[PDB]
Write a protein that binds this DNA or RNA. Sequence first.
RNA 1: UUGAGCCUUGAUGUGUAGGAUAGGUGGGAGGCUUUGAAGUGUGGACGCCAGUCUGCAUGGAGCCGACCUUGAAAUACCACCCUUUAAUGUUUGAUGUUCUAACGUUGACCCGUAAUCCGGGUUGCGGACAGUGUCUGGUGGGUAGUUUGACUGGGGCGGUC
RNA 2: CCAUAGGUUAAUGAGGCGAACCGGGGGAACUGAAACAUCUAAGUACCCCGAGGAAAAGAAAUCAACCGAGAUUCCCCCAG
RNA 3: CGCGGGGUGGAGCAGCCUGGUAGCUCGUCGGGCUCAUAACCCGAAGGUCGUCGGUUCAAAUCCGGCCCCCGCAACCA
Lengths: 77, 149, 223
Amino acid sequence: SRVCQVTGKRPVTGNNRSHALNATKRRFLPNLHSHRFWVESEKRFVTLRVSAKGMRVIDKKGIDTVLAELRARGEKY
Amino acid sequence: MQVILLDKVANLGSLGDQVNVKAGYARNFLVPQGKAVPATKKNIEFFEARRAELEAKLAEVLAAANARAEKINALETVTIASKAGDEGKLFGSIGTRDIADAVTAAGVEVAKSEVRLPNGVLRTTGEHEVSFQVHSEVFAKVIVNVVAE
Amino acid sequence: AKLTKRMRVIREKVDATKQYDINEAIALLKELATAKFVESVDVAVNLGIDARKSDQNVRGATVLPHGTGRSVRVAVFTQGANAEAAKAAGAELVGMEDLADQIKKGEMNFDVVIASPDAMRVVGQLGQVLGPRGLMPNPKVGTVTPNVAEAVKNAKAGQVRYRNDKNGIIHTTIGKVDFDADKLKENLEALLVALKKAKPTQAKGVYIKKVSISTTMGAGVAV
RNA sequence: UUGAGCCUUGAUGUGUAGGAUAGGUGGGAGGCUUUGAAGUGUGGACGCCAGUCUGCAUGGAGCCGACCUUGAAAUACCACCCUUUAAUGUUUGAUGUUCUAACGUUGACCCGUAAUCCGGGUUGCGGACAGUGUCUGGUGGGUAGUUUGACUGGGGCGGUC
RNA sequence: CCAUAGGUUAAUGAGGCGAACCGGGGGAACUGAAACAUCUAAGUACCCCGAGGAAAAGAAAUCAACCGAGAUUCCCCCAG
RNA sequence: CGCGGGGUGGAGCAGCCUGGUAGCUCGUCGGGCUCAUAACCCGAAGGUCGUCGGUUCAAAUCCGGCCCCCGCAACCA
């Protein structure tokens, strides 16, 4: 499973249509990279898996709150 | 993120103009230094009289001159030497915490030196260039000692 | 200095990249004309739209509320004693079928032509030489009327002709530098409406967007 | 360093013969000018070899046209508009290089671990690209699905509504 | 080192069997259109999560038409 | 039928995209060099510039028609 860990993206089923109209599957899947954070409550470079446009939400919520949401959904990182 | 400019950070951007910047960079460089801010569009009509014609009145006296002739003319060797053995290897530079150190402490903070290198960091042995501050925007240069006496 | 004594003055006075309000700059334009000869204040519209396509052509004539100040020769085609009354009322020459030969031969010295409907038979075919010159008598403007002693006053009231050029431009006079700046502004207003009333309806790209006002040996400003 | 988009200011228009460098369009025997024009040297450049320009010193009100004659068309001085061409301001590119924050490492060493299957650490090397996820215009005989009119001494070319 | 990876202890819940119904999110195929191309088949089978005797919903950022209504649920109607 | 190009004396190609503009080679008719030819030297004749229009100071050239050539496209119910 590709997870963005802050903007709610997960691998899910769905259609692809432009004009024809054909029964072609899409299955919505994101891009996947990692970034290294510093929180100064522990002396580590903390690595997390991420996707596009998540950092604007890691700012708006704060990194403490984003990791608290992962625990609130029981999601390992 | 759309932000309003407060400082000279853009070649096409001006005080009270709106620019688009990534939020992680804006929260790193622009917002904590009071150089650009989110929203703020409702306050810009006063920026000319409150900031522009205030900063420009200090730039009428600070410095109103070109170039210095004090502390800045010389080049000579200084009392600073580099720590290395007979293999001539430095094994990575500790920079501002070792270059001016005389005590090499371990229980307390070693004082951060204010010196500036023309190449940023040291990497190899021998006769390298270093500089120190002589006024608010002005630095004077010297070369390191290699006789180690 | 490569620029002449009169020319160096106006190079400090205006620059084409700058913003100007013509409600104050049309009074400054009176001082940009530097020709010793009689100068004109001219409106230029830059095109387009296509310069060759006949469906996108703009060619016409109009009456200005203050005229241009230029006195004109006006020809009248009428018969009987009404010819001498039309002369005295505004016509500068009389038309007859001997002058219709000069018109077929393209030899014309007049800015307007007037005709009585009983005499129009002298010039009624001449559209292929008067039409491309903006001179053809037309009932839809009163230049064909049994009242030609009124139409000659309307001809000397101040009219202008306008046609597009292959370069992508159209030039027209709005007055003399002797005029009050509100007469020049009402002539500017009137001319831009006369060009708007002449709009081509199937043309692509700018028509009336790019407008300037300029002067003989002088300089100009955008509207 | 500037190939390109935009900006601003300088510069510029000569086949050739006949006197001439007519950029184009429209005006115009009076109009450029005394704080200013020529010319050829130390020394350069452009080229249609016609001539001519930047810099500088000068010399010091000029000078053209008519008549004659070239050409679609005049020859002072110019509103307005291009062409070519170098810089200025700026974004963006092909490339060379520099920094390492991103990225690769099918490098090395350590820890987990008397486990090298792969996660973290230590660190060298290259470095703003690749890889992926798609948006998007093609190509795709491979894949996936699919179409293929009737009359006819055998269908075939021919006749036919 | 602080920690992290890993480890230990205590309290708590669920796992399967299924009958029929049922909520939450996805979701065919063979057909039919007398081919087939939007459409039909079809929100039926089927899958993951979850549960009660029912489930679920629920108090207008909803309807209405100048009259006014003032949560949800369910049967006969509204309507082929 | 659409779009961008091709068609300039008998055979091939510059010119067109800037209005001041017709050329070159080979054929043919002259000759020349050779005993003589493929080639080479350089004059003369042949002008609806496929073919018809439009506009002006200026189009074979620009914007169109008509007939063929080169090459694959879209513009509907």
